[PDB]
Amino acid sequence: LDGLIAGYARNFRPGIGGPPVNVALALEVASIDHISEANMEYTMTVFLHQSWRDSRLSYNHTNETLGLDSRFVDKLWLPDTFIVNAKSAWFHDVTVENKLIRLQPDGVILYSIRITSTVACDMDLAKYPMDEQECMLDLESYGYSSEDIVYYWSESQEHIHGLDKLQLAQFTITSYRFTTELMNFKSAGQFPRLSLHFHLRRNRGVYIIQSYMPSVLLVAMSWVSFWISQAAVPARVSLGITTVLTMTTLMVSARSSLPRASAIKALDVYFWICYVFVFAALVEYAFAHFNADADTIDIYARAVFPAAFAAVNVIYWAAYA
Amino acid sequence: QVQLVESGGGLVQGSLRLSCAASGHTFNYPIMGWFRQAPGKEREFVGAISWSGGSTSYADSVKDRFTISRDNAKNTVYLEMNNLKPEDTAVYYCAAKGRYSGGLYYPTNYDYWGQGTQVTV
Amino acid sequence: QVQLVESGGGLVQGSLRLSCAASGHTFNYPIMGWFRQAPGKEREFVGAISWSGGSTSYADSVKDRFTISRDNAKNTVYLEMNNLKPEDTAVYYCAAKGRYSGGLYYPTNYDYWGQGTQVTV
Amino acid sequence: QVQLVESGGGLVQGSLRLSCAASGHTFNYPIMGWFRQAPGKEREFVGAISWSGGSTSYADSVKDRFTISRDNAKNTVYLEMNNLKPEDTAVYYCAAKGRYSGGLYYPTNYDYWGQGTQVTV
Amino acid sequence: GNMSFVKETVDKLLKGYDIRLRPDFGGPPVCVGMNIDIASIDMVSEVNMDYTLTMYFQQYWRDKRLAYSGIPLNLTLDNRVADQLWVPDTYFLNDKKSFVHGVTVKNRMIRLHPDGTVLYGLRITTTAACMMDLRRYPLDEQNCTLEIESYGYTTDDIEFYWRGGDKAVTGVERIELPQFSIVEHRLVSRNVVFATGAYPRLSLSFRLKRNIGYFILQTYMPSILITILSWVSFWINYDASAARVALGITTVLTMTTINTHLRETLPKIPYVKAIDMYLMGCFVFVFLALLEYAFVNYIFFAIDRWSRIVFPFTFSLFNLVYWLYYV
Amino acid sequence: GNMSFVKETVDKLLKGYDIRLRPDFGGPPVCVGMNIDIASIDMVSEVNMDYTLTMYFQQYWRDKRLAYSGIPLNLTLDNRVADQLWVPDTYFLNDKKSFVHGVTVKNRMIRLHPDGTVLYGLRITTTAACMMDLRRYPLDEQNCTLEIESYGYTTDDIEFYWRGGDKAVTGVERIELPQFSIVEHRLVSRNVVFATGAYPRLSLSFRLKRNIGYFILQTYMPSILITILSWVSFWINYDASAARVALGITTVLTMTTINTHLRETLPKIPYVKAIDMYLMGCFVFVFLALLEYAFVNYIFFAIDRWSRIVFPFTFSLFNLVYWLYYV
Amino acid sequence: GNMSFVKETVDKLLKGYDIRLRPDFGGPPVCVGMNIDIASIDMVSEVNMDYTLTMYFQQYWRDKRLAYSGIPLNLTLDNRVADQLWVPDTYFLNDKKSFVHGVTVKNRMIRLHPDGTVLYGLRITTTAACMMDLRRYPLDEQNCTLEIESYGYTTDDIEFYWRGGDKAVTGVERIELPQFSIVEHRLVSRNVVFATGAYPRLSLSFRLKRNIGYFILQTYMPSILITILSWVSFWINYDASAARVALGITTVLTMTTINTHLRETLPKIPYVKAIDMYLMGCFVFVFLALLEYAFVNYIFFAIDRWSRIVFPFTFSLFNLVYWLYYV
Amino acid sequence: GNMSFVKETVDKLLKGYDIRLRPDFGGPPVCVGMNIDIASIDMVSEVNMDYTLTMYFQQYWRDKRLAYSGIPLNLTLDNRVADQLWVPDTYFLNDKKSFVHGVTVKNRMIRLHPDGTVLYGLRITTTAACMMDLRRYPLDEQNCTLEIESYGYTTDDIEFYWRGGDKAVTGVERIELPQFSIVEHRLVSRNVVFATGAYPRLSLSFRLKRNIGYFILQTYMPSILITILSWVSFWINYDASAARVALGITTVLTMTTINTHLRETLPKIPYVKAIDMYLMGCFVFVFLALLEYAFVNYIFFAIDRWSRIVFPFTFSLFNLVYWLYYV
Ligand SMILES: *[C@@H]1O[C@H](CO)[C@@H](O)[C@H](O)[C@H]1NC(C)=O
Ligand SMILES: NCCc1c[nH]cn1
Ligand SMILES: NCCc1c[nH]cn1
Ligand SMILES: NCCc1c[nH]cn1
């Protein structure tokens, strides 16, 4: 191994001044830990495999691959692959640097590393929480243009991605796609970009049930005032005010979950609709009390309010679903 | 400062249940161990158990024969010796170990010890 | 964009109080400085004060003789010159400095300047 | 700025209780120390105590004989000298130390000192 | 006692030593024995579905290149000599973030043996992911594992085994989790096949049983008291419209606040937990109580006593069915 | 295509090269051209008065010691060669915490040119402090700057300039802040004098305009609804003492909770914000409404209708004056 | 004063020096004396069951390989020379995260002596785990320890002792914990046996007494005031159904909020704390008060005065029993 | 302009240079002059009792080993040359966490002089502990210090002094704390004696005065408004039992919530703050108001007007005494 390293120029790509180095790339997604819509980011741990041919390291007399450790990595030239949309990333170095270099007699190098990266994912919360999000993972050479390094997904990518085996607490990976953009020119020269697109569908279950049902029950609580006698002024007034205040606090608390969210979410729309009904119920009794200062109004409201709320619910659910 | 008193020995030809009552700062010593010392032989580890969680460990010789459990209400740890053998003739002690005092199997790691009951079969 | 107008000079033989009124984006320029330029001599730093907090600094020559304070209601910084000396004969300017523009004592760090009042004793 | 006044000395042949009253910025000086200086000998550390928490330290010579305690209501630190010996004939001072002023046993680390009471037995 | 002689012996061992090549390179795989001395399990997080583990990780293997003769002692060298020696590329497959303590020096031990056996110890604090089934929460039982695998060397080059059999992992009794108890631990050895090849695998798993004591005081008891509070309205006269309506409102609002707070302390799972079922059941009773008075108020402009015997009886039946199902 | 010839050329360049000495040491200052490609502005924090910026920082200078002949190509070398080359000591004056990405390698680019020109690129994520004037919050406009300066070399040794003039900074359109919009950006070049000497300065500044859409839904609308809620008491008969008093209490309490929550999301500034003025005004109206009924209750043991026409009229006037002043 | 002569002396010492070998390798164990100068205890966390400690850690040992003659001075060398010298592998067994300060240089001291004695000082900030018994919280007393042990060298190769006896640890008076007071500190030296061998152990322990002043104002006083507030209902006429019922509801709801808030600031322990018992007792009194009026309302459609003398008397007895038991 | 000549001169200086030995080793102590250019004070935390400081730390000393002749210039070298030069072991005694900025290179400056004078500058962000007396909070005045000391070298080997006298520290006017104002700063030089020896000490202290503007709006004003709200019950007729009781309850509950929230934003100190006294006083008035109606209700089954003149008069007297005492 010392003979091969002797005379090896680390600062130069193989065939400098010649055809660009063809680097095969493969991904093995291990997990997707966090998917934060508040921070517009997701955390992914992946095995990154890079394969290329370096004729300077071709050897003789041996047909067996030279399985080498991470200590030999610093001696060789490596592609400067970086994640374009990574907020932060780092290597796993316990108990040692999780790096692999397997050298073949023809000069083909297999380079595998285990990295965990926090990747920014632009999310549209218009239909939140009934929203489906798409997140990307862009891979690109930082300093070498298309004249020096060319990337392409390896043939084994479709079999080792492991995205089907992933289990996500709140989302479900519906579809995934491996795209190659050969027409990216950021600053100087063309930089081929390998992108991994996967679609996340937020799970609809008890999570959405927690937000919507109490809002419905607050509206239901306001309906109960209709069956209460109009002479019970403190009782119906107290029922009206408490539901309105609870709705107001719920709206403030719900938006506080995503502090930097200057968008109209479907959950926010539902709270606005619920607030109108609870506020109208108190106004409905106020009109009845003012008329007394009426009985038909309460009877009509017992049928109009539940019917109107059901109708607007159908419109709300049909549009967003 | 932990005080240990053990009882329930005697001589038998069978099933026997030793016991060990603790008192004092038992929080700083959450592990109780059982040791026996044959005449001339070095003191031998029998089994250990934690006050909280009931996690237990046993030696190979007494594995599947002796059972150790404790009740925190009485601060008592009891060793149930079943299927006795003539090799089980030694003075049985009760000991307590600190939180960061090391391995269970080594008697020198334990700070407070009981009087010791002689059992002969 | 900050505009500076200063007044309160004149000729005296005593206590004098200069003033400097500011207007515009004063938030981006929280530091106000006072400078005087003798004929032929380079412009000399007199004193500086922050708009917020009232922290002030003075030169050794004018230390314990000149006092600088400001009122944010009028956006005015006033220099009170007491115990005047014949060495205090120069054109007094008013200047504003950016947040990250460097040291106070160097006039080139200041962006906006006043007209300048001539004082002779 | 801390002012220290000590009293309760006199001459005896016994139990004696010195005292030291403090006033000023006692928060910046949370440690009070007691020192004695024999004629010709260098000033000797006796004991120290913190204003908050009552943590105390003593020298070997006065260990188990002198007791130091304080009451924050009166801002007073008192040294109770019991079982006196002829070796305990020196001028007793009261001192205060800063938060980051270093070790207790070194008098030069203390900033403010009392007048000093002469005790002879 | 001859330090120069020992220095010459060690320098001879490292002369020509190639860290890039494993012992018996190109030949039989090197067997690596592993033992773990657990120090503590600091945290178990349901929101992040991971646990923090501190342990003494020790590796045993024989390297004939390091064999020495004439010294009947085990050479305990400085930990900095590990940089000049070959060590297995052992990594934890399910860890999320791990490090080796380095105060006052790196928590690392190298101990050579005359036959070439090398002891390599590390004190590692690791955060390992552990997927949790919260359907029976907080009466659930969790199985958290720690996967140990070689990164680069396949089974043809390296082999793993628990040194000491079932006694390879010690210190399980040291685990003091306020919320969990260690029911059992297991040791598993197997081979895992990937695209790059087959790799040895060592697995250490714990079965954790959650303690119900905290949740009884925090969630279950307050929910019951609010439900009992709603029953007070039955003994209050129907003419007190303000009093009985206020009783119904406040109990319902308090029940909602408890339900919202609990779900914020857990991951946004789509399925219903056991505790959620209890809170939903308690919300039904308080909501029915307020509806009960509305029916009484409606007919007025015997029912109360009839309601007095139904709700406590039904609530007791609901509790009996709930606890029997989940215990 | 002759890698050996290129290797000899590069080895010749680095033979005798002294990284401790700047190009043209002791002579004219070296001009360094800078261009920034903004990637994103992740966060803008009012509490910490800082923003997070990710960008591609590129430096352009000529070093005749690195000039090579016979190769009509631009040598794109490995980023690890930057440790053997002189680079400007460029630092950001107003940054609070910054780092260079290092996955899978350090995000660094070195590109030599035949004439000796060196291109040095870095991908840097920086948190730069930005003092904010919150007097007009949330209708305020902020000017956040990024100061670029040399640390050790004065103007006699190094000079900075924006390479490309006003086009030196690109990617401003990529900035997608949910709460802000990039009104304008400016490039400033000047010299800053300290005690140690005069240093070159490059400044990049953005003018941010806050979006009012979030605050209308979160704070302004709930406050208005509570104020309208207090007006319901006027239509309620005066004999309903419990009802009208409860309406006054709850509106006042709800107004206080909104005011307290808002101030906790912002730094503890001593001056009054625009939003604080609106909340104080809304609190006055609800407090006066409760005082209005107390006056009615006192005289009883026409006023209500007179109060019905005043508060909505006064509140509308208050809103009209408030919005016109701050818009 | 001859720097060249000193340079030659030091170069002679490090010529042939092997950092991989401990002093007297293969012979008697090297005795290492340790002193600690405590700087501060920044935090004590009940939720994480750990404390943060900053200290000056100093180690004393003699290495005859570093003995020098002809220089009647103690050589205070640069801290970077410690990388070329053997140092003990001292680590803290119960620490969770520790580091050595490195501004403006690494907080490290090397001071040689003519006889070969080496003084090695480090400023270390460490977070050490400390299991806490919260049964008597907040009137509890805690014993937090700091375990010092060698990682690789057994008792056959190294020995630890507190240099200076009981005076080895200083700066205990510097500890200023707002919530705790240092009752006592102890120094313990012993040997700990593991599977790999027997290792020396030094233990530094503090007994912390919690201050009750904060909890009286934060939790105890508000709970008492709410309980007294419930007693106001007894003096209110029974016909005021809305008033007395509202009094009972609000006191119960407020009591629940206080109980929930307190338990969220502490780890989810399964046992009942002393403060929890007081909150449960206070909840019983307010709940009984509301039940008392329901009984009065039921019989109506003397009891109040009889209830006026029981609850304050019983509550005073409950407080007397509670405080005597836990004090 | 002869780079080769400069390279030869610098190589000659570093040939035989021993970084392990201080200048004038074994002779007179080396005097180190220090200047600080404050950049900003980012945060002041009462809970953690510390502040974050960013500054340009510069050290001045003369090393005759680095003296050069024939070059009438000050050699501004690359910051990486500092690793081959001796630098003082300056550390901050009261810091909790500090670092040196390293973007795009380490924020470090080395500037040599013909006579051997060395200028060493560092941009350091430090978090220094500062014990605070919160008895007069929020009307308190704090004195936070920054202790500068040598770690290894005693006064016999090194000496510290503020270069420039009282003008050594600049940039104090740049400090923009929203909650504090810099009343004064002082420079102190002294010697501190430890067990290891006597060490030089430089101290930089600031006196901070808290701004009352935030606390008036956040805490003081809401408390007053609630107290005024309780006075409304006096004008309400006594027959409105539900209304007046509800008024008393809600004011008391709101007062408790404000008191609880404030204490959660501050460390759990055992003593009573000034703001706590005001909240306790406000709680007494609202509690007495509810007790006042209970007395009125009790006697019924003149007092109100008599109570109308007492509480506002007493509350005004309470405010007057409170503000005069703490101002
Ligand atoms: C391989 O080895 C042979 C025999 O030593 C030698 O002639 C040849 O140059 C080497 N390299 C290649 C590429 O064949
Ligand atoms: N870039 C140099 C900054 C500075 C501060 N003080 C002096 N110079
Ligand atoms: N310091 C050695 C700890 C240990 C654990 N297991 C064996 N040894
Ligand atoms: N700077 C030395 C600190 C110290 C503590 N103890 C002894 N010395």
Side-chain angles (χ1 to χ4, degrees), chain F residues 161 209 314:
Chain F
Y161 68 96
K209 186 176 183 179
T314 315

Short mmCIF file of all heavy atoms in Angstrom, two decimals, chain F residues 161 209 314:
data_model
loop_
_atom_site.label_atom_id
_atom_site.label_comp_id
_atom_site.label_asym_id
_atom_site.label_seq_id
_atom_site.Cartn_x
_atom_site.Cartn_y
_atom_site.Cartn_z
N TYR F 161 -12.87 45.53 -2.16
CA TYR F 161 -13.79 46.14 -3.11
C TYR F 161 -14.80 45.09 -3.54
O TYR F 161 -14.50 43.89 -3.59
CB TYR F 161 -13.05 46.70 -4.33
CG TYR F 161 -12.44 45.65 -5.23
CD1 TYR F 161 -13.11 45.19 -6.35
CD2 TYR F 161 -11.18 45.14 -4.96
CE1 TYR F 161 -12.55 44.23 -7.18
CE2 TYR F 161 -10.61 44.18 -5.78
CZ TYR F 161 -11.30 43.73 -6.89
OH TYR F 161 -10.73 42.78 -7.70
N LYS F 209 -39.17 44.81 5.54
CA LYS F 209 -40.49 45.32 5.86
C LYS F 209 -41.32 44.17 6.43
O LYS F 209 -41.49 43.15 5.77
CB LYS F 209 -41.17 45.93 4.63
CG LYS F 209 -42.49 46.60 4.93
CD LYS F 209 -43.06 47.27 3.69
CE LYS F 209 -44.36 48.00 3.99
NZ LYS F 209 -44.91 48.67 2.79
N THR F 314 -66.51 56.05 19.27
CA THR F 314 -65.19 56.40 19.77
C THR F 314 -64.15 55.35 19.38
O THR F 314 -63.02 55.69 19.01
CB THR F 314 -65.22 56.58 21.29
OG1 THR F 314 -66.37 57.35 21.65
CG2 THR F 314 -63.97 57.29 21.77
#
